[PDB]
Amino acid sequence: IVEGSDAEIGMSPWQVMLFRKSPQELLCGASLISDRWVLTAAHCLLYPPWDKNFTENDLLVRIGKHSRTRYERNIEKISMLEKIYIHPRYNWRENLDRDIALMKLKPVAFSDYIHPVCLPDRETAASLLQAGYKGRVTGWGNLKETGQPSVLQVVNLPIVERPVCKDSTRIRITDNMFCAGYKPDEGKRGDACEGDSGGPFVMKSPFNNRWYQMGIVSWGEGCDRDGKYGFYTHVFRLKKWIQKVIDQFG
Amino acid sequence: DFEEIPEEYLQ
Amino acid sequence: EADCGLRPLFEKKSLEDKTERELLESYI
Ligand SMILES: *[C@@H]1O[C@H](CO)[C@@H](O)[C@H](O)[C@H]1NC(C)=O
């Protein structure tokens, strides 16, 4: 996260770290959506242009963390993966359309540090996914494009008007994406960066005071560049697939 | 860079 | 979950984090 700040303890208890077993390293962010299910970006698991195609046994998830590099004894919990599910129409060939995946875990025990985020209903999505409305992005990714944080970072960023998103890039933007970030004239800054992808973009509903995951950190062009925006998987738009997977395999 | 995690999670 | 999105160290205790108000103020 560029131009963010250190998270408070327990601020993002749905945060998950996707961790490579060997070599031991941070791969991506992710989020806890129930005691047995973790949501992330498909490209964190499958990206053939970079020869990436992880199997369950290649990976762990680390839940409850704050420190990036520390083993947080008696706080974090480390879970093995039972199964990965990638969206069947994830477009790794072109533009990362439908950049979403689920990982089924044993259940993790909830605690002060470990708690699931909500997934949006149609109405919460319609109400909150508006240009100018801010969400929150969290992760352990790099602090700048060109270094790495001690603890989880947080930044709040406004959703951007779709034509501005489209006009910022040559990539084809779809309805399964939204973009967020400040404009050059807005002064404030901030973005996801390398290692943040797969993590959550959340909003706190003013109606029921719950946190909802509206987006997944999907892609960008550099980090925190003027005139560029971060792109996020539109979780609500893909929720029927999420439910189908959990209903079938949960 | 990362602190070793308990061996039980790598079995 | 019925309890989703309510943080033990924040909403459950009626404590506000340092920047959530920025989000609320944007929901205009
Ligand atoms: C990824 O790996 C699985 C299992 O080895 C394989 O069956 C699948 O076809 C691969 N997907 C791509 C796009 O290469």
Ligand SMILES: CN(C)S(=O)(=O)Nc1ccc(Cl)cc1
């Ligand atoms: C350009 N990327 C590979 S990055 O360095 O991770 N930057 C980035 C910026 C924004 C978003 Cl949403 C996702 C990724």
Ligand code: NA
């Ligand atoms: Na364009």
Ligand code: NA
């Ligand atoms: Na920018």
